[PDB]
């Protein structure tokens, strides 16, 4: 039997055996020219750095994205990425040479393209198509070829990831003097996915190599934790199969981060720009921060974050009704609603609305033992216009689910994002005054989040 991989390249010669028939080197070869970008500058850099991709479908998942537009996609990873990887292989990711040109003229990042590089005539095209920078395998190429096609792009003043996917091909890397290796964490002989490929191949990379951790990386924990292995990453499925791109990119690389207590659309709108993925709006009328149905709407129209509405103790067929007409996107209990009530909720909220439990932690953490709760919100509770709860509490808990609140700020924010929490919940701490929110706070804490 064949792997997955082995086919794939067995594909790859033959589209390369035919294109070569359409578009013969010696047609373009000489007006090719050297890439103006620099691949191997973007990814140097204090902050670990991001190369995300475009990818329609993989041979893992079929079709990713069937709402695929190059050049929107381009639009939103330009304000966030180092590189941006284009894959060009047809027939398993459903790319194109062509959407090179469309991505490069957009964004300015190095653009990266991504296929099954076997022949040097497709270093060519692909320079001949914009590309800065391309992806050479050690799982399909011996060290001939590799030094090879190495010399080719950089003959064209083009970078090199330079892949591998086990320890022998990690060692042939350092002997090839590869200045950027890529980790996959997926193995294309046989598609399985894990994530300690790098973390037990990246340490011996060595300093003088800026190594990418490639494949399987869906949360800002897990980039949290990896960045302490490797330089950066490559993703591309987690984000690509989303509608909203922007929350999708920012939720990888900020966290799942609420600004909770919104009573302005300008304030949802300068939460929205920080980076933040979901805005609160709150429905208890013991609340200085509380807020109305119309008033709602207003703050609402501002930004399109998700919003989440925070109730206490509340009537269902009331909080059934803001959901509906609001348009919210979770409900946040913030009182004592026990099993019953959230099972009745349940049973009366349209499926699409998301159901949060808000808990607050005393010496010891309460359980998460709930059925209908998608999402958690541990905090020093009764709002607090105040200050935190033990962190060291989280330990030996799985907190996929689980937003930390209480305290939240500028000055403790670095520290909170360490917890290893899916996101971080903000309210009084980024505040000029109850339910007004300070601009500057929020840009400052959101500049926190990435400072990785």
């Not at 990831?161 to 350092?174: F, H, K, M, Y």
């Not at 129209?301 to 067929?317: E, K, M, S, T, W």
Request: overall charge negative.
């Amino acid at each position: 039997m064949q792997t997955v991989l082995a086919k794939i390249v067995a594909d790859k010669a033959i589209w390369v055996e035919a294109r070569k028939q359409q578009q013969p080197l010696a047609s373009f070869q000489n007006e090719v020219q050297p890439s103006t970008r620099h691949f191997y500058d973007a990814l140097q850099g204090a902050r670990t750095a991001f190369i995300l991709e475009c990818k329609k479908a993989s041979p893992s998942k079929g079709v990713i994205r069937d709402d695929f537009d190059p050049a929107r996609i381009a639009a939103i990873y330009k304000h966030y990425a180092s590189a941006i990887s284009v894959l060009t292989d047809e027939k398993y990711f459903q790319g194109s040479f062509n959407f090179l040109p469309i991505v490069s003229q957009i964004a300015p990042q190095p653009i990266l393209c991504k296929d099954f590089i076997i022949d040097p005539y497709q270093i060519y095209l692909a320079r001949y198509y914009q590309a800065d920078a391309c992806l050479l395998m050690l799982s399909v190429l011996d060290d001939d070829q590799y030094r090879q096609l190495a010399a080719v792009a950089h003959s064209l003043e083009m970078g090199v990831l330079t892949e591998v996917s086990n320890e022998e091909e990690q060692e042939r890397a350092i002997a090839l003097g590869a200045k950027v290796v890529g980790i996959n964490n997926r193995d294309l002989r046989d598609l399985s996915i894990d994530l300690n490929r790098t973390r037990e191949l990246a340490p011996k990379l060595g300093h003088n190599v800026t190594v990418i951790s490639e494949s399987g990386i869906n949360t800002y924990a897990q980039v949290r934790e990896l960045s302490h292995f490797a330089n950066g990453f490559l993703i591309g499925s987690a984000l690509m199969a989303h509608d909203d791109l922007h929350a999708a990119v920012r939720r990888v690389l900020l966290g799942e981060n609420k600004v909770c207590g919104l009573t302005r659309g300008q304030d949802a709108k300068a939460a929205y720009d920080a980076g933040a993925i979901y805005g609160g709006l709150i429905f208890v009328a013991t609340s200085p921060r509380c807020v109305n149905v119309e008033q709602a709407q207003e703050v609402m129209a501002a930004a399109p974050l998700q919003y989440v509405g925070v109730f206490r103790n509340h009537d269902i067929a009331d909080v059934v009704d803001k959901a509906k007409v609001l348009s919210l996107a979770a409900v946040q209990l913030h009182g004592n609603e026990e099993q019953l009530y959230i099972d009745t909720l349940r049973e009366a909220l349209p499926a699409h609305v998301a159901i949060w439990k808000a808990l607050s932690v005393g010496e010891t953490l309460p359980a998460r033992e709930f059925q209908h709760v998608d999402k958690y919100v541990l905090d020093n509770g009764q709002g607090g216009s105040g200050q935190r709860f033990d962190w060291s509490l989280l330990n030996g808990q799985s907190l996929g689910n689980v937003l930390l609140a209480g305290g939240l700020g500028a000055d403790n924010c670095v520290e909170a994002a360490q917890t290893g929490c899916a996101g971080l919940d903000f309210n009084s701490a980024v505040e000029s005054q109850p339910g007004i929110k300070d601009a500057r706070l929020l840009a400052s804490v959101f500049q926190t989040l990435r400072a990785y």
